[PDB]
Symmetry: C3
Subunit: 151 residues, 3 copies
């Protein structure tokens, strides 16, 4: 019936002395993402896609720059409050390193639990940047997301 | 229930001596976006998402940067023509979402006005239109303030 | 009804010595993409189809070991796995970002290839072309990016 689509984008720098947390998963690595929160680039992109589908603005407006899962849960709350139900989420992480493949199902599990969705409605994809640009040089990590909701 | 989705992308350089026009809003700034038309990166991205959802090709095709009739073209006029062609193809627009990526200036004070322009041009209520603002966290040409990028998504139904 | 959306991204470097193949179409150029055929557009569309189906990604379905298959063979196999998970493809839209060469003359051919491979009416497949306005590695002609979106229904 009243379907809406949303899209999200995020990028953070990789810096020494920070933990690397993506999709709620702490991944062993010598650098981590820099941000005012835990800098979970994946969760932020999904969050923006959800706000965007519900026409509620953006993550910058809702949570002025701690735990990104808490923010994702709050986002899901605001989406429900606006009268929408989430139908599915898809996403991509662009990181030259480290290897993300072993952690993906954990990420999906986290996101599914945070959005109160079954696993089959949550997806997370991994890509390198084929050594191009700042992502290619491992200076940051990007995430992209898409969300479908219904009123 | 014949739904279709589309996506769009655009980027333009930020240069001295040009109006900064994003989402139809003239924003006070010392630089502006360089292009053949008014170079409204956000409206272009949305226009491409709508043409894309309707499988009508793209804005480069409909409103060519090689055709002199679009020199300094009002991108809201282009967006309204896109919406007309989308309607004529048989599609109704259900919603639009978008992102602008810029180091500067601060876009937040202008976002609501952008949403209102897009809503007006697409004949949608405000609650079916969204615009989001992002920095690029200081990375790359966007982080260096060399250009501004926009992304869009649209849902339509035949 | 049970609609789902998916999105996809891909980028390959652009250097002398390889054919330029985008959307199944070989395009005369002084350079080409590095990868198989390195078909950036087919890869992104393949990723958006798997993501709409919540089946992971092209890296997981089609790794470097398992044959030699070109990117259209992968798109078709992608499409068959999507169907067995219960989903029908409703449409695909995409954008190729390349500073050069001119892609517009080749779009009809890419759409035809994609629609054939996905068994879709032509009017549910779209491909768009963008430059990067001379910004970044894309704008210096050091690589080509593709973006895709797909809608499916169970
Ligand atoms: O652009 C990086 C970024 C800023 N911000 C504010 C809330 S979540 C988030 N990610
Ligand atoms: O890539 C910048 C660009 C080209 N073009 C043609 C019509 S609107 C527009 N934006
Ligand atoms: O990053 C370029 C790339 C990697 N990969 C794996 C399967 S298809 C494909 N394209
Ligand atoms: N960093 C990564 C990129 C792509 N695939 C992975 O598994 N990891
Ligand atoms: N350029 C901007 C990025 C993020 N937020 C803003 O308000 N403006
Ligand atoms: N490389 C290209 C970018 C934009 N339009 C084209 O036709 N080709
Ligand atoms: Zn973030
Ligand atoms: Zn433009
Ligand atoms: Zn590829």
């Amino acid at each position: 019936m009243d379907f809406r689509i949303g899209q999200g984008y995020d990028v953070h720098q990789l810096v020494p002395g920070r933990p690397l947390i993506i999709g709620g998963v702490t991944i062993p690595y010598e650098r981590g993402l820099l941000g005012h929160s835990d800098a979970d680039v994946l969760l932020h992109a999904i969050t923006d896609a959800l706000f965007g589908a519900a026409a509620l603005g953006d993550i910058g407006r809702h949570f002025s720059d701690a735990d990104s899962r808490a923010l994702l849960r709050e986002c899901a709350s605001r989406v429900a409050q606006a009268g929408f139900a989430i139908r599915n989420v898809d996403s991509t992480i662009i990181a030259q390193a480290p290897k993300l493949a072993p952690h993906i199902d954990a990420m999906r599990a986290n996101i599914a639990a945070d959005l109160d969705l079954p696993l089959d409605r949550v997806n997370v994809k991994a890509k390198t940047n084929e050594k191009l640009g700042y992502l290619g040089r491992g200076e940051g990590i990007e995430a992209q997301a898409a969300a479908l909701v219904v009123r």
